[PDB]
Design a binder for these strands. Structure first.
Length: 437
RNA sequence: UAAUAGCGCCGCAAUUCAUGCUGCUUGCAGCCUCUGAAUUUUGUUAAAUGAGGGUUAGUUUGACUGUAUAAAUACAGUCUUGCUUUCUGACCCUGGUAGCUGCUCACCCUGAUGCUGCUGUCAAUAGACAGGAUAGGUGCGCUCCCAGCAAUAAGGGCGCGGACUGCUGUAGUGGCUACUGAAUCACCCCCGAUCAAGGGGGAACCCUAAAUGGGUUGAAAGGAGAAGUCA
DNA sequence: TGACTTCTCAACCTCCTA
DNA sequence: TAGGAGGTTG
């Protein structure tokens, strides 16, 4: 599921409860994590479950295999304490305060009730979590947990500048992973269909093998309960999802001179429904691209000044690049949705170092026809000024936005030369031709 | 006095187009009013970017429902919370105190993606005082260029000693800590809190005759963690 | 440090209390 | 009976 997103909030409590949480994780959770890593490093992740069992009594029950899960995710990769992750929809118990605010109660923490402070841009997610747990309570465990919209959540701490307290300096922050497709009723229908298919495949797969008489039967009972309870749905909002036209394709061409141009084109016919350039996608936020290019130049020069020896280079850095890469993705997906586009086509990232080099060569030859010295000089100056875009965050951001809205994404091969609009159109047509296979 | 020239950007123009408008013949014809695209040609008495370091639980971008709704949107109602970000404003500063620490210099030459560059007064010393972000140059910036430095790029020349070193003063230039000075804001003012909490008062614009009558008094985007690799 | 890459995204079934 | 906390497992 690439549609899942992450919401965040800040948790608030008395100094006493905050002290208990700080002590509990900093003195127990992160030492246990460090110990378990030190153990796995010298080991000659299933065995980790019984590896941690002896460590249980050495120094909060759910937090012990929370640390196991953290360790497993660390291993599979190949004064703030580490984040405490609850990888369960039901680890958190939501409630409404007497003053109306939401509160979280964690399973391992009986008396630790934290009031939730969030932004109105994402309060509806917390209200949805509350309504979901209330619906399960009303149905008396008659709804499958795969549709409570709260996949998992980890609690972290954050740093301050008061410099005068053990924990009052650090702010709590809850990060809940929420499945965006799980909001609307029809998206939940699709999620239920996929999860039922996965359950069928997994039950068929393990039935071909033999397991313990009690644990395997417990798993089977759990899966049958899930399949039974998954058909009973929730009273969620209804949205018609998205239709999508197969023959309409929105191709996006990435380059150096123009970071992103877009062509909405028919495939059954050959007419381009509409082009849009970078200035037309950013709109009123176009000065952001130019000031970001200037900032990128400044930062690159500063890094090359201090590659020998200086302090960290984050001086003057920001997330303007991410903001632009999100504005661009929003605009592109909106443009696709306007024309009922059925798919957004993007260049393969690997063929991105080649494309920018070819574009620089093309620009140099366009400026200086055959003067090789001038072409090299202009290429150097252009690389100095028009720095390489961050074509990785853009592709990922477009993927996230398209998956959220429902527009499928295909990958094509960007043509080497031609005008950016022509490159975009031919990219889209090439993608459609490959899809014909 | 100097910034010639070059590159990127920003607009102003012209031509050509359509991703534009018209017209139905719905893919054609014309046109450039809008919206843009592509060049080249310019930087005004004009336009748009761009403007050193900081300051808000800042405002807006929100959810559901019912519609008119294909949908946009708009309306109505209810609810709304304060997270992480990017702009635009407005405001404050151009720091002090102590310490601790890194770098670089016998002296010359060439001169780096090297450093410095605001105004005014006092001096015309090298520094204070007052202001202050319009801050060396071009409309704006740049590794470009200009003036000075340049030991703190690189390379070369090159004296006295010890056997790679010294010719070195806080001298220049950086970093770290602790305390500390101002703004602690989003129409303005006052009080009040910061693991919470808002309240009061005032001004102006539209509706409204007028009414504590209502509003308005800038907007945007979010998928987060962890690990590894490359540069 | 930037850039890239990988991965992460339960859940009903038990027992226990108030 | 309805929460609160533990279990397990490919």
């Amino acid at each position: 599921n690439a549609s899942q997103i992450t919401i965040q909030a800040r948790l608030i409590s008395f100094e006493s409860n905050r002290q208990q949480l700080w002590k509990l994780m900093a003195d127990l959770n992160t030492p246990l994590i460090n110990e378990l890593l030190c153990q796995l490093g010298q080991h000659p992740s299933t065995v980790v479950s019984q590896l941690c069992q002896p460590l249980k009594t050495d120094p909060p029950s759910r937090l012990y295999m929370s640390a196991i899960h953290i360790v497993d995710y660390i291993y599979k990769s190949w004064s703030l304490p580490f984040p405490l992750v609850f990888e369960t929809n039901e680890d958190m118990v939501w409630s409404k305060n007497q003053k109306g605010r939401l509160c979280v109660h964690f399973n391992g923490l009986s008396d630790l009730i934290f009031e939730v402070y969030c932004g109105n841009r994402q309060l509806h997610w917390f209200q949805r979590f509350l309504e979901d747990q209330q619906t399960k309570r009303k149905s008396k465990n008659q709804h499958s947990s795969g549709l409570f919209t709260l996949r998992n959540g980890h609690l972290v701490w954050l740093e301050g500048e008061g410099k005068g307290e053990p924990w009052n300096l650090h702010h709590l922050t809850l990060y809940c992973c929420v499945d965006n497709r799980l909001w609307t009723e029809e998206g939940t229908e699709i999620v239920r269909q996929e999860k039922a298919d996965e359950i069928t495949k997994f039950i068929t797969n393990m039935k071909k093998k033999s397991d313990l008489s009690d644990t395997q039967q417990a798993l089977i009972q759990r899966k049958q309960s899930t399949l039974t309870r998954i058909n009973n749905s929730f009273e969620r909002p209804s949205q018609p999802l998205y239709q999508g036209q197969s023959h309409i394709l929105v191709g996006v061409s990435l380059g150096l001179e123009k970071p992103a141009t877009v062509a909405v084109v028919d495939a059954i016919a050959n007419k381009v429904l509409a082009y849009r350039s970078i200035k037309q996608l950013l709109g009123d936020n176009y000065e952001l691209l130019n000031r970001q290019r200037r900032q990128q130049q400044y930062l690159s020069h500063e890094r090359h000044k201090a590659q020998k020896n200086f302090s960290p280079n984050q001086f003057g850095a920001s997330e303007l690049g991410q903001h632009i890469d999100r504005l661009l993705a929003k605009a592109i997906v909106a443009l696709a949705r306007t024309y009922k586009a059925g798919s957004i086509v993007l260049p393969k990232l690997g063929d991105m170092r080649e494309v920018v080099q070819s574009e620089i060569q093309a620009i140099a030859e366009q400026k200086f026809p055959g003067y090789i010295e001038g072409q090299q000089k202009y290429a150097k100056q252009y690389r100095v000024n028009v720095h390489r875009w961050s074509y990785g965050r853009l592709i990922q951001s477009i993927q996230s936005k398209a998956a959220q809205t429902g527009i499928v994404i295909e990958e094509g091969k960007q043509p080497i030369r031609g005008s950016p609009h022509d490159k975009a159109k031919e990219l889209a047509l090439s993608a459609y031709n490959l899809r014909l296979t």
